[PDB]
Write a protein that binds this DNA or RNA. Structure first.
Ligand SMILES: Nc1ncnc2c1ncn2[C@@H]1O[C@H](COP(=O)(O)OP(=O)(O)O)[C@@H](O)[C@H]1O
Ligand SMILES: [Mg+2]
Length: 382
DNA sequence: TCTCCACAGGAAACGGAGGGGT
DNA sequence: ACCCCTCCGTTTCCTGTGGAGA
């Protein structure tokens, strides 16, 4: 069941950590020279990687980690690497509950007190015997929320209840919501990923392109274009790769032995409409109803005020015979919607006429629509 | 140059539905 | 049986603030 368009689609998929990473050799080499000593060696100095999305932080770390294991497995010095993703499983609890399991512990999914599961960690941990590297990708989330900052700390202290940390995030805006204490070991080595010039994204895809595609089907300069779109903002290779791979996905639909400029634009189109739909589906009821209220007011231009949004929100709820949340919460919900980038909001004074938000819709409207309609409540409001 | 509107947006905590280990 | 958890949308209380009016 092959194609003529792909030879290895999965290589493009969001998990394949490749084995060469163009333009991030130094970040590769440093992390290598900061963890190798556990190989002869032991306890490696703790380290930290701020940077932006699509800079290839995760790619690197996971690679170094693959290799660090590749050697240890050939040498036969126990050296366990564990990967934990703070964002995809979001809370201070789970982040421990996870990091526990890898060394081999039970997943009570709720039971606990973060400390209870922290304890269990250091026990099966300090009953069996080696040196272990934790990688906490995207820990900024961690401190976002309670015991977040506290757990962080513990884990950096873990090493002397008798172990090493690699913290990853995506915002210098974190050197600061470190308690300098926490700050001061969550990164003994400052590993920082400066982003991607276009001809760099160029070169990356180029590479991933021999791996994944058949060797003529990818048109000339299409990759330059993917770069262009991914560079258009801050450099982000996910999106570059996301793009060029959705591009070929879409060619297979339109049944040709080639990708060119079009399938990319149509790629951009498919991606947002699915991102959008995926959110507005996975949105709380009253969250949905606010979104509608915005939809309903941004009819014309008269961008919706926080204020207005509430009252026809109030209208909607009643029109359905439901209780209604607070303005505070409506307000919160707005800011959320804005982060999900399903809306975009300006903060602006009207003089003595108060202070409020102009909210407008950022995403494809009809996208949002069919989304909303699938929920059997909003649907009623036709 | 002060007033005071219409909120923004942080902190806490809740409630009532998932569950613990003694 | 006891008191303890976590979670997630939400409630309560709150303090801050750009600029049109007088
Ligand atoms: N230098 C690179 N060479 C090849 N592929 C890369 C490079 N940097 C990133 N990628 C790819 O782009 C995607 C996003 O990169 P990643 O490192 O996961 O982002 P983040 O910086 O958020 O960890 C990954 O799927 C990865 O395969
Ligand atoms: Mg990542």
């Amino acid at each position: 069941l092959e194609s003529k368009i792909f030879r290895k689609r999965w290589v493009l998929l969001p998990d394949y950590v490749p084995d060469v990473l163009p333009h991030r050799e130094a970040e590769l080499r440093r992390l290598a020279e900061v963890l190798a000593p556990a190989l002869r060696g032991e306890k490696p100095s703790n380290a930290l990687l701020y940077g932006l999305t699509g800079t290839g932080k995760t790619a690197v770390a996971r690679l170094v980690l693959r290799r660090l294991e590749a050697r240890a497995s050939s040498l036969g010095v126990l050296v366990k690497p564990i990967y934990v993703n703070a964002r995809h499983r979001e809370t201070p609890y789970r982040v421990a509950s996870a990091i526990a399991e890898a060394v081999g512990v039970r997943v009570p999914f709720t039971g606990l007190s973060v400390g209870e599961v922290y304890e269990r960690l250091v026990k099966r941990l300090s009953r069996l015997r080696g040196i272990y590297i934790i990688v906490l990708d995207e820990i900024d989330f961690l401190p976002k929320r309670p015991g977040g900052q506290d757990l962080l700390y513990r884990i950096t202290r873990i090493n002397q209840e008798l172990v090493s940390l690699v913290g990853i995030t995506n915002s210098l805006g974190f050197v600061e919501n470190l308690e300098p204490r926490v700050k001061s070991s969550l990164g003994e080595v400052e590993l920082v990923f400066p982003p991607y010039t276009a001809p760099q994204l160029r070169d990356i895809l180029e590479t991933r392109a021999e791996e994944a595609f058949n060797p003529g089907v990818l048109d000339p300069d299409v990759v330059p274009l993917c770069a262009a779109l991914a560079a258009r903002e801050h450099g982000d290779a996910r999106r570059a790769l996301d793009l060029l791979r959705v591009a070929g996905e879409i060619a297979e639909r339109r049944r040709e032995e080639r990708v060119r400029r079009e399938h990319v634009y149509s790629a951009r189109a498919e991606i947002e409409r699915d991102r959008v739909s995926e959110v507005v589906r996975t949105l709380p009821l009253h969250a949905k109803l606010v979104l509608l209220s915005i939809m309903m007011l941004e009819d014309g231009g008269r961008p919706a005020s926080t204020g207005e949004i509430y009252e026809r929100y109030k209208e909607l709820t009643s029109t359905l015979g439901l209780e209604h949340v607070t303005l505070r919460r409506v307000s919160g919900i707005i800011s959320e919607l804005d982060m999900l980038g399903i809306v975009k909001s300006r903060v602006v004074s009207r003089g003595r006429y108060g202070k409020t938000r102009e909210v407008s819709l950022d995403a494809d409207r009809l996208a949002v629509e069919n989304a909303l309609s699938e929920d059997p409540f909003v649907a009623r409001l036709l």
